[PDB]
A paper describes a structure:
Recently, a shortened Dscam ([name]) gene family with tandemly arrayed 5′ cassettes in [name] species has been identified, which encodes ∼50–100 isoforms. [name] sDscams could be classified into two subfamilies, [name]α and [name]β, containing one and two variable Ig domains, respectively. Crystal structures and cell aggregation assays demonstrated that both α and β subfamilies of [name] used Ig1 for the isoform-specific trans recognition in a hand-in-hand manner. Furthermore, the cis interactions were established by the three FNIII domains of [name], which assemble into a cross fold with a kink between FNIII2 and FNIII3.
We found that FNIII2 alone but not [name] or FNIII3 could promote cKIT tyrosine phosphorylation, suggesting the essential role of FNIII2 domain in mediating [name] cis interactions. The gel-filtration analysis supported our observations in the crystal structures: Ig1 mediated the formation of trans homodimer and all the three FNIII domains were involved in the cis interactions.
Author numbering: 291 to 320, 324 to 336, 341 to 389
């Protein structure tokens, strides 16, 4: 066994004033893998976990730039992070 490879194909599907919806694909095979979503304002650091390859980030600041990483995790440990994805919430 070994840590999983990174999540793949990360897309920011929708963005609103206070939410951002994320989509991705499971990592290349290395067992059960879950995910760690780290996001922050790009100008506190937030971290949430998910079992499915989608996440709706909530109660974000309007008209704000965000960075987001996603990591895969199994019972060995976490993958190397995704590349950083940039998105921007809609102004109020």
């Amino acid at each position: 066994a070994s840590p999983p490879s990174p999540p793949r194909g990360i897309k920011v599907s929708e963005v609103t004033t206070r939410t951002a919806r994320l989509s991705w694909q499971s990592p290349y095979g290395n067992t059960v893998v879950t995910y760690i979503v780290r996001y922050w304002r790009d100008e506190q650091l937030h971290q949430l976990t998910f079992q499915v390859t989608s996440a709706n980030l909530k109660d974000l600041h309007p008209g704000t730039s965000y960075a987001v990483q996603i990591l895969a995790e199994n019972d060995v440990g976490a993958s190397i992070p995704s590349r950083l994805v940039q998105f921007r919430t809609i102004e109020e």
